[PDB]
């Protein structure tokens, strides 16, 4: 029962979505770990996303759950954000982070046109 690190949610794709009607948001989506497929039985793989802008001294943790995509509404146009998501496989629980992804929120985030 040694805690090994098989596959974290890799291919962390971060996109800024600006809807015409809805509010502009950061759309974070990741790829589920290869093999296993924690779909059978009530043992689903939950994901947690932590993010914060450059001038943020503290991290904002947002637990997504079973869904493999998360949206951030509280964003500052024209600022750097750091994002991380990780899952907890049956034989490999986590207590630390690693995949720090750098995403730039465009100044065009707000429709100042």
Supply the CATH number for residue 34's domain.
2.60.40.10
Check residue 92 and report its DSSP letter. -
Q: Tell me the sheet residues that pair with 80.
A: 104
Dihedral (CA of 32, 33, 34, 37) sign: negative
Q: Let me know if 21 is exposed, middle or buried by CB neighbors in 10 A (0-12, 13-18, 19+).
A: exposed
Phi, psi of 109 (to 5 degrees): -60, -45
6 neighbors 33 (Cβ within 8 angstroms): yes
Q: In angstroms, rounded to a whole number, what is the distance separating the alpha carbons of residues 59 and 105?
A: 17
Tokens 């093999």 sit on residue = 35
Total count of domains within the chain: 1
Q: For residue 63, give both structure tokens.
A: 């637990």
45 neighbors 89 (Cβ within 8 angstroms): yes
Check residue 109 and report its DSSP letter. G
Cβ atoms < 10 Å from Cβ of 112: 7
**Smallest Cα–Cα separation from 81: which of 111, 37, 50?**
50
3-class DSSP assignment, residue 108: helix
**25, 38, 45, 66, 91 from 42: Cα distances, Å:** 31, 9, 10, 11, 16
Cβ atoms < 10 Å from Cβ of 70: 21
∠ at Cα 10 (64, 103), nearest 5°?
75
Report how this structure was experimentally obtained. Answer: NMR
Q: Is 91 annotated in some ligand binding site?
A: yes
């Amino acid at each position: 029962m040694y805690i090994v690190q098989p596959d974290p949610p890799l291919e962390l794709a971060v996109e800024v979505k600006q809807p015409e009607d809805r509010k502009p948001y950061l759309w974070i989506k990741w790829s589920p770990p290869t093999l296993i497929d924690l779909k059978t039985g009530w043992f689903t793989l939950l994901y947690e996303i932590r993010l914060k802008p450059e001038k943020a001294a503290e991290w904002e943790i947002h637990f997504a759950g079973q869904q493999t995509e998360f949206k951030i509404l509280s964003l500052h146009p024209g600022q750097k954000y750091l994002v991380q998501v990780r899952c907890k496989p049956d034989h490999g629980y986590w207590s630390a982070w690693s995949p720090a992804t750098f995403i730039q929120i465009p100044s065009d985030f707000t429709m100042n046109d």
